[PDB]
């Protein structure tokens, strides 16, 4: 019975590595946002919805991994 909870917590620890695939994700999206606004100052009001869209629609894949971690930890 200790083994089930032990491997449960180990797997919940393992299933948070995927957030490094989201930190770099938000980074590259806002990096391209900065480089795109800087080289063309009149594109901000056209490129900003694509920036927010790409931001959260890329995080979602780290938050899936965090939900696998929560279903391990508490379920």
């Amino acid at each position: 019975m200790q083994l089930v909870l032990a491997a449960k917590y180990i797997g919940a620890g393992i299933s948070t590595i995927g957030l490094l695939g989201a930190g770099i994700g938000i980074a590259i999206v806002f990096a391209a946002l900065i480089n795109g606004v800087s080289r063309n100052p009149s594109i901000k009001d056209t490129v900003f919805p694509m920036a927010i869209l790409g931001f959260a629609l890329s995080e979602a894949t780290g938050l899936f991994c965090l939900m696998v971690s929560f279903l391990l930890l508490f379920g």
Binding site: A56, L57, E59, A60, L63, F64, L66, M67, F70
Partner: peptide
């Protein structure tokens, strides 16, 4: 399920 679980995960976390 992705469209909902995005929002759920953000608010819960």
């Amino acid at each position: 399920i992705s469209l909902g679980l995005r929002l759920g995960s953000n608010i819960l976390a």
